[PDB]
Amino acid sequence: TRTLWTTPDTSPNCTIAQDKDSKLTLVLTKCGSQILANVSLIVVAGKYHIINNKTNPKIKSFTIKLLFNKNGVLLDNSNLGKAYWNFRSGNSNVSTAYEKAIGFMPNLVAYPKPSNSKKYARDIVYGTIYLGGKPDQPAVIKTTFNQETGCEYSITFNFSWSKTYENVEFETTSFTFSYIAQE
Amino acid sequence: DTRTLWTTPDTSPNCTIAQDKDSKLTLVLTKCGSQILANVSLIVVAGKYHIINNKTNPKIKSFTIKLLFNKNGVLLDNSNLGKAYWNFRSGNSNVSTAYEKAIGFMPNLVAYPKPSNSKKYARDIVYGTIYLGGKPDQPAVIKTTFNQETGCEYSITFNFSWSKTYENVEFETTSFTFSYIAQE
Amino acid sequence: YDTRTLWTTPDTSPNCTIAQDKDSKLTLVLTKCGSQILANVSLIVVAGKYHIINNKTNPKIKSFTIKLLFNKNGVLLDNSNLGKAYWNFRSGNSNVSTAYEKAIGFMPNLVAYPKPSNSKKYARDIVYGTIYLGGKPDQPAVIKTTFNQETGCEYSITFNFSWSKTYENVEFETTSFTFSYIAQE
Ligand SMILES: CCC(=O)N[C@H]1[C@H]([C@H](O)[C@H](O)CO)O[C@@](OCCCn2cc(CN(Cc3cn(CCCO[C@]4(C(=O)O)C[C@H](O)[C@@H](NC(=O)CC)[C@H]([C@H](O)[C@H](O)CO)O4)nn3)Cc3cn(CCCO[C@]4(C(=O)O)C[C@H](O)[C@@H](NC(=O)CC)[C@H]([C@H](O)[C@H](O)CO)O4)nn3)nn2)(C(=O)O)C[C@@H]1O
Ligand SMILES: [Cl-]
Ligand SMILES: [Cl-]
Ligand SMILES: [Cl-]
Numbered sequence: 002t003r004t005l006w007t008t009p010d011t012s013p014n015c016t017i018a019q020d021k022d023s024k025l026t027l028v029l030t031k032c033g034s035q036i037l038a039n040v041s042l043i044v045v046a047g048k049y050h051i052i053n054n055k056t057n058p059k060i061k062s063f064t065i066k067l068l069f070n071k072n073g074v075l076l077d078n079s080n081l082g083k084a085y086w087n088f089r090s091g092n093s094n095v096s097t098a099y100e101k102a103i104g105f106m107p108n109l110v111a112y113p114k115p116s117n118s119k120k121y122a123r124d125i126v127y128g129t130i131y132l133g134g135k136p137d138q139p140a141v142i143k144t145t146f147n148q149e150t151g152c153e154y155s156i157t158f159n160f161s162w163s164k165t166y167e168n169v170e171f172e173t174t175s176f177t178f179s180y181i182a183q184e
Numbered sequence: 185d186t187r188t189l190w191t192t193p194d195t196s197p198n199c200t201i202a203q204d205k206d207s208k209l210t211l212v213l214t215k216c217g218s219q220i221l222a223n224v225s226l227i228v229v230a231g232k233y234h235i236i237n238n239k240t241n242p243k244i245k246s247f248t249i250k251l252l253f254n255k256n257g258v259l260l261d262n263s264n265l266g267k268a269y270w271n272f273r274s275g276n277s278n279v280s281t282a283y284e285k286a287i288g289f290m291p292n293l294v295a296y297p298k299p300s301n302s303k304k305y306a307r308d309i310v311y312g313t314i315y316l317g318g319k320p321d322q323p324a325v326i327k328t329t330f331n332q333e334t335g336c337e338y339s340i341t342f343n344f345s346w347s348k349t350y351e352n353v354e355f356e357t358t359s360f361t362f363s364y365i366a367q368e
Numbered sequence: 369y370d371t372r373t374l375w376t377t378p379d380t381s382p383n384c385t386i387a388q389d390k391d392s393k394l395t396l397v398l399t400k401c402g403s404q405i406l407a408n409v410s411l412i413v414v415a416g417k418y419h420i421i422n423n424k425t426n427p428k429i430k431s432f433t434i435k436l437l438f439n440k441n442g443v444l445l446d447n448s449n450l451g452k453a454y455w456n457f458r459s460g461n462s463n464v465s466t467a468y469e470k471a472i473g474f475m476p477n478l479v480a481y482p483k484p485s486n487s488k489k490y491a492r493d494i495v496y497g498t499i500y501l502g503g504k505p506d507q508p509a510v511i512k513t514t515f516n517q518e519t520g521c522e523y524s525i526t527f528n529f530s531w532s533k534t535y536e537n538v539e540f541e542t543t544s545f546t547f548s549y550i551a552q553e
């Protein structure tokens with residue numbers, strides 16, 4: 002029944018374009034064979050803080066990657082900082098870094114690493130979130146399992162938009178999804 | 185605690201949007217540790233929002249259903265949802281005693297703070313779309329907001345809206361699932 | 369043995385018959401979180417009529433249905449599109465070795481989602497979602513899931529897939545979708 006999370010405060014914990022430019026709020030709750038996931042994003046500074054596609058027509062997407070080793074431990078090339086990711090204790094985290102979280106990893110049979118074998122779309126979940134909570138400011142959140150190199154498991158969030166936003170702050174509504182657990 | 189707080193799954197009106205008991209809100213909240221798994225649908229049976237005609241009434245485009253809770257997670261009487269059949273599940277009905285404590289089912293206050301002079305972040309909203317009459321060409325938006333009402337310690341608010349011009353369409357919906365971060 | 373999960377296994381071995389025998393893999397995982405079932409679904413078509421969609425050549429091919437029919441004990445009936453052989457409780461990445469006898473706690477609730485009758489039919493028993501063919505964001509298809517509307521069974525879950533765009537040689541294999549439903553017990 003346990004939960005891996007980023008504390009749900011607004012303290013930046015994530016680096017998209019520059020150090021600590023964002024707060025990823027991610028909560029993974031183990032419900033047996035499935036992980037129930039809840040995600041939102043606040044960009045606080047830098048390139049993706051205020052979108053202006055009149056000024057910058059090609060600024061239309063970015064990616065946040067969580068890379069994990071064989072024990073389900075977060076690797077430092079991840080966009081999310083290691084100090085910010087742990088099992089929940091109250092509204093905070095355990096003060097000791099976890100050793101094992103394989104039960105939270107995306108299942109490798111469901112979602113295999115890239116190979117020469119046919120690639121299926123099963124390892125992707127699509128959703129839409131809304132910038133500033135406004136229903137006319139959609140952005141697509143594409144979540145992909147186990148497609149990154151340099152790791153045993155991965156979860157990546159690609160944010161993209163097709164509208165021409167003029168001075169829109171990139172901070173989002175929340176989205177829930179699930180995925181099949183490794184064990 | 186993997187308990188379920190719900191409205192019961194019957195179709196007996198339990199909700200007051202425009203007039204007394206004009207609707208059945210079916211809401212099921214199931215605790216999976218630090219997240220609440222929520223399932224929701226709505227049937228309007230009477231009054232202003234029962235049969236929508238936007239040719240004759242083009243400005244009838246949205247309405248709101250509020251659930252207000254005290255410090256103990258107990259539903260307040262001024263909610264649109266009636267208190268009588270909002271309780272922990274037993275079979276297809278409820279436990280025989282009104283609950284006194286459900287803080288573990290409340291939306292987390294750090295994730296979703298009450299209104300203040302601090303910046304309001306969008307992460308206290310979840311958007312979804314449901315379909316009137318089960319028809320794929322009859323979308324309506326369900327906007328769910330956590331802890332943005334006053335006169336309570338916690339809240340869940342459902343705003344229903346639509347942009348299509350409906351003509352004599354009965355407002356009864358498909359179901360939507362979401363989750364939120366639990367207070368404890 | 370995992371008593372809280374009924375699934376198809378996560379492999380890609382065909383287990384489903386839409387238009388011809390074993391033309392598809394339905395990956396379906398039902399996880400009991402008490403009074404709610406958390407469901408995760410995707411579909412891979414490997415052969416036959418629904419494998420490669422070409423609506424220039426075949427303008428009428430726009431939808432199909434996959435039916436799961438259950439008896440009073442929550443056991444899958446053999447007229448379901450999904451095969452009984454690999455629908456079972458989880459054991460690792462496989463299944464428990466004997467066929468299950470009871471799964472009533474995984475069935476969609478009959479008061480929430482009643483069988484057809486003279487009583488008014490409500491839309492509550494439907495969940496709509498959209499999945500994406502080939503993982504491409506410009507290739508939507510609608511997944512309409514309906515609870516307990518089939519005859520000849522105690523319970524049912526049916527998945528209707530449809531699309532409105534004119535696809536030209538698009539393989540029908542989907543992204544994943546999550547939903548939940550109210551459990552019978
Ligand atoms: C699950 C069942 C279902 O989907 N039902 C839908 C049915 C059904 O498909 C058919 O009836 C068949 O049964 O169709 C409906 O629509 C068809 C008839 C009406 N219609 C609408 C359109 C869209 N346009 C016309 C148009 C619409 N607008 C509305 C304003 C603009 O849109 C927003 C906005 O403000 O930006 C979008 C935003 O998300 C809305 N917010 C919410 O919904 C909040 C939850 C917002 C809001 O509603 C208003 O602001 C409130 O006032 O509106 N303007 N103009 C025709 C059109 C053609 N295109 C181009 C591409 C078509 O779309 C796809 C694609 O196929 O490529 C669709 C695909 O899903 C997208 N992928 C993703 O989103 C990934 C997650 C892609 C992708 O975005 C791009 O490819 C980029 O990669 O685009 N666009 N518009 N046309 N016709 C119906 O019958 O009513 C809707 C039912 O919901
Ligand atoms: Cl655990
Ligand atoms: Cl009441
Ligand atoms: Cl045809």
Ligand code: NA
Nearest residue numbers: 135136137138
């Ligand atoms: Na606007």
Ligand SMILES: [Zn+2]
Nearest residue numbers: 045050051170
């Ligand atoms: Zn700013």
Ligand SMILES: [Zn+2]
Nearest residue numbers: 228229234354
């Ligand atoms: Zn009516």
Ligand SMILES: [Zn+2]
Nearest residue numbers: 413414419539
């Ligand atoms: Zn193929």
